[PDB]
Symmetry: C2
Subunit: 663 residues, 2 copies
């Protein structure tokens, strides 16, 4: 019944120790310098008043990234002979470019929020240690670069290019803990990664030399492997199996036996070498992962040990039973424990140890804290609505709480979901058949959204906002319910022909999202339990690595927009000779940021990727351009995708071990 932050700011040393150990078991780590302070009153107060506003900081950071995502392309700022307003001419569109006034206003708001956030910690942390930390200095450097950039931009209304996007992506990276940990792992693994890159480059060079010397006199060498450089380029492309039969079709036409060589080369390359590369990364990742968790454990224990130092003023490493009983009484509130009588506890103690005045030392106290936390679940907060006692204690209210806490509500919700499936599938069937009876079924579907929002309100009322928010799936359900209700009220408030809301089809998809929870029932069977559990666990766990890949994609998009900005034009004559026009890929150019992101995603999956490389090589006229693409393939596909594969495998194995250790 005591708030954790209120426990930190004021309370007995026993209350402070209980709250600190609860924080340790939660996993949150307080800043180190705050622990060193004596009772850290003002610093803790400021720290929690800062932490209370985390959502605002995260929203500001996402808005800052979307500012990059929405910025006008630089090449359009330079005067083009046809205006940049013509969307169809440059094969770009479907997002509005911010005007100068709106752009500067949005940037000023974002920069102000970022500045106040990054300079808040100086109030509580202290000047000297704040200036000591390297993270503070790099963040200050990023924010001052942003400030000078926006200042020179405002005064402008010469720079060869705009440096803001990279800086803001970097500061967005430094914002999040998980992204920082991922970068630490990557920096650890790069050292052993480069050696495998060197071996792979040596193998490619040797194979390319063999192929070039073998096919020089033949017609296929005259057609494709004209020189050693082109031979190495084609061999590197073939190593990815992007164009297997295309590169050596003339050799196969000239002589059938030649294919054997290529059959010999692809097999040893794709199956022996590539997998080996993955293996290397795999091992390294595992090792680095261990290091990280080890450090985390140490840090936790360190802060945990502070509690042992906090409870004892004389700090002689002496713990007394009459002193520890207060700690147990404090923890039984935070974590549920069986009711223990004082006489019962005394009998347990004196039968447990024959020696009089037995002492619990620091290490076993730390171990038993972990043991009691792991064995017993946490105790939920009573309520945030508890301030009104009459409504809480009302007979109908307690009957409703008893009803909802029973699983019968769960079976009722599952039955509603099944009826929802029947209704949505029949409505979609009628839509496919283009019958006129779709509207009543759509109106009935609206009632299901009403039922969902009502049940969500009931659950959040009975459990409490924090208890409801604690469950991971509950957050997704809450977001889905709120977006459904927003769409519903937007449609109902205005009886006008909207482009999207008037049709009303969208609602069905939202229901489908809410219905993914049925897949959870499939966890019941033994055959698919491990697969379903691993798939569910991956979604929150795999987020930092996907975010790192996304931010690398953003950096590469920012790089590509400047170099390949205006090359793809409708009036350009050289473009139609390239394969982009032949295959109708012009929509995936690098003209603006969203198109760059889409084409980078397409390059990421290795689906017909060499067409962009050689098309842009022909368009630019310089070989060095391919470096960009080549660099990309080295950075994200061989390293980051293999990292994702390794993480998925490790998660699956840990899930299997956890499943098997139950029996």
């Amino acid at each position: 019944r005591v708030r954790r932050s209120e426990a930190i700011t004021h309370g007995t040393p026993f209350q402070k120790a209980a709250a600190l150990v609860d924080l340790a078991e939660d996993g949150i780590g307080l800043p180190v310098e705050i622990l060193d302070q004596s009772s850290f009153g003002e610093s803790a107060r400021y720290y929690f008043i800062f932490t209370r506003l985390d959502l605002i900081w995260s929203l500001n950071y996402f808005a800052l990234l979307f500012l990059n995502f929405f910025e006008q392309p630089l090449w359009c700022e330079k005067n083009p002979k046809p205006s940049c307003k013509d969307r169809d001419y440059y094969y770009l569109g479907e997002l509005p470019y911010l005007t100068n006034a709106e752009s500067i206003i949005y940037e000023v708001i974002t920069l102000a929020i970022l500045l106040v956030h990054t300079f808040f910690p100086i109030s509580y942390e202290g000047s000297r240690i704040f200036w000591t930390s390297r993270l503070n200095l790099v963040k200050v450097a990023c924010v001052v670069i942003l400030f000078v950039d926006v200042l020179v931009d405002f005064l402008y209304l010469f720079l060869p290019f705009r440096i803001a996007p990279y800086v803001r992506v970097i500061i967005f990276i430094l914002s999040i803990r998980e992204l920082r940990d991922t970068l630490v792992l990557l920096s650890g693994m790069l050292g052993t990664y480069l050696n495998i890159l060197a071996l792979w480059m040596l193998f490619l060079l040797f194979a390319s030399w063999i192929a070039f010397v073998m096919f020089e006199d033949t017609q296929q060498g005259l057609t494709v492997f004209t020189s050693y450089g082109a031979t190495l380029y084609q061999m590197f492309i073939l190593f990815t199996t992007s164009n297997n039969p295309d590169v050596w079709i003339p050799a196969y036409k000239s002589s059938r036996w030649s294919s054997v060589f290529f059959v010999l080369y692809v097999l040893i390359g794709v199956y022996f070498v590539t997998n080996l590369i993955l293996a290397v990364v795999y091992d390294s990742f595992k090792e680095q992962l261990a290091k990280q968790v080890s450090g985390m454990d140490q840090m936790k224990r360190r802060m945990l040990e502070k509690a042992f130092g906090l409870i004892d003023s004389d700090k002689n490493g002496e713990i007394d039973k009459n002193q520890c009983i207060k700690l147990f009484e404090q923890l039984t509130n935070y974590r549920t424990l069986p009711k223990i009588s004082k006489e019962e506890f005394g009998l347990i103690f004196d039968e447990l140890d024959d020696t009089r005045d037995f002492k619990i030392n620091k290490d076993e106290f730390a171990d038993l804290c972990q043991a009691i936390a792991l064995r017993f679940q946490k105790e939920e907060v009573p309520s945030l609505f508890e301030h009104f006692p009459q409504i809480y204690h009302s007979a109908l209210s307690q009957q409703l709480r008893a009803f909802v806490r029973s699983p019968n509500f769960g079976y009722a919700i599952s039955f509603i979901l099944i009826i929802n499936f029947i209704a949505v599938v029949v409505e979609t069937t009628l839509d496919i058949e283009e019958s006129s009876a779709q509207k009543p079924w759509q109106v009935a579907e609206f009632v299901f959204g009403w039922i969902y929002v009502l049940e969500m309100a009931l659950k959040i009322y009975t459990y409490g906002f924090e208890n409801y928010w604690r469950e991971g799936a509950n957050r997704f359900d809450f977001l889905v319910t709120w977006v459904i209700v927003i769409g519903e009220t937007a449609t109902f408030i205005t009886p006008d022909e909207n482009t999207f809301f008037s049709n009303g089809e969208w609602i069905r998809y939202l229901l489908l999202a809410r219905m993914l929870r049925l897949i959870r029932l499939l966890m019941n069977v033994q055959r698919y339990r491990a697969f379903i559990a691993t798939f569910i666990t991956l979604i929150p766990s795999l987020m930092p690595y996907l975010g790192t890949i996304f931010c690398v994609l953003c950096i590469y998009c920012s790089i590509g927009v400047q170099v390949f900005g205006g090359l793809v034009n409708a009036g350009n004559k050289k473009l139609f000779e390239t394969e982009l026009a032949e295959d109708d890929y012009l929509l995936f150019n690098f003209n603006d940021y969203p198109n760059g992101m889409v084409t980078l995603f397409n390059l990421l999956v290795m689906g017909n990727w060499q067409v962009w490389m050689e098309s842009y090589k022909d368009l630019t006229g310089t070989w060095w351009s391919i470096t960009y693409f080549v660099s990309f393939y080295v950075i994200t596909i061989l390293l980051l995708l293999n990292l994702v594969v390794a993480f998925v495998l490790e998660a699956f194995f840990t899930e299997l071990d956890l499943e098997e250790e139950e029996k």
Copy 2:
């Protein structure tokens, strides 16, 4: 100085026990029924006289498979309007089809050798147990099917199709011990592998239904997702990322926001589902592999304990030191051991065990045999040329043997390898520039060939053929050396303008194969030690699994030839509308067996695989045609390829664990 086979056929029980424990350490397992026999004299004699001819049996098996590989296509046997002689018309060639007389003679010889091989074991094994074994029964079934097939073929000169190609591939599998074990590994996997396929099929069905209903009203669904059947077909291909931008290029043109759905689906499909499929295959492979090695270990110990039973006639589990010393005396011949004096061993025993008449029990004797072999290397056979003592004991001979066994000989050959590489690169450069000075340099390469055959003769002479053959790397060099001298003398014996041998460019590739030993020198550096060591081990270890994939291709090649034999024709009008003609893929048809193996390899590596599926679907005219390609992707690419990926990863980790425990 005693032959192992001679030890089995005749000798003291001590010699028999020593030879049996040496066999156990080697890893070869004698047939179970022979062990039960009392001294198994005649059975062992016949068993080793059979084993002496293993090479002939393996050559017969490979010839039998190549018989299928060389057979005339069945559709050409039916009368075509243009003759099958016209190679260019049907886009087939570069291998000669056997005439009826040569075909029947070759098949008769192969079948006779197969029959005598498969019916030899009845002589020693005994009738009842031979008929008891299921492997013998299935092999008899295969051979009798082959016999009746060749008989009806000879009498013919009606069957809807020829059953011979499938049968002779199957009997090839049961021949090799390594391939038999691999199929046992697979049979356990189908239990858990089929379960995941249900989830994968369910995911495709659900995702395709969403995509079909979403885009039905839009323009893109009018073009591509015309019906749900085509929608599932198109979504399945996109799961393989074979055509990522092509499938949803009309949707992207109509509305940019449509890309969000396809980006989301590919990401959750390729990165989550595909890797989870690999994780399931990886875990089952590790589990099933443990079952195989455990059974092999149990079988080895079972035959190992027989020697303990054999040495003790009364078989009361009593081992005597004066009885045991004879075993130690015999093993020092088979495996090198430090010289032990009779009195020295006596002083060892009493201090080691205070109790008088200490007995070695049955169990630890097996464990002792394992311990001694691992720490002490095997003793090489003296020589097969030892029958001539004067040449062996010649003054020059012993000096020559001292030089080669000394390490200094190793540096000399390594120096020659470096010089050879310089000679090759300078000779190849002249060919690129087409200078007239290539011919003098080309002759110098022939001289280095004479060096390699000479050094091979010296090495085999001093070590002996069995010692030389024991090392795996020496076996590779022996074949390379012999193929050089066979080709080298062919040009010299016949001074004529050969199509290939006259040019002489073939020698450089054989020399480069021999210089691959320089890679073994790169193992010294610790940075590249793990990568190179695993790569070398994979080549012999990965053969049984790669062989299984090859045999699966042979079965599908026979199936493809019958159904798609005559579809691809130059005069065929519908063919040019297909994508094979547009992309110039006509040379990869299924017209004959040699072309079928090449095109199936292209489908194996995911390289533009969808063109073959939808070209033959239009060519055949039936939707059931895609069943052949879809079944190929599920059975081979998802299961077998992931198994290869699983094995490569597992081998790498064991290499790291083996290396780290050295320190």
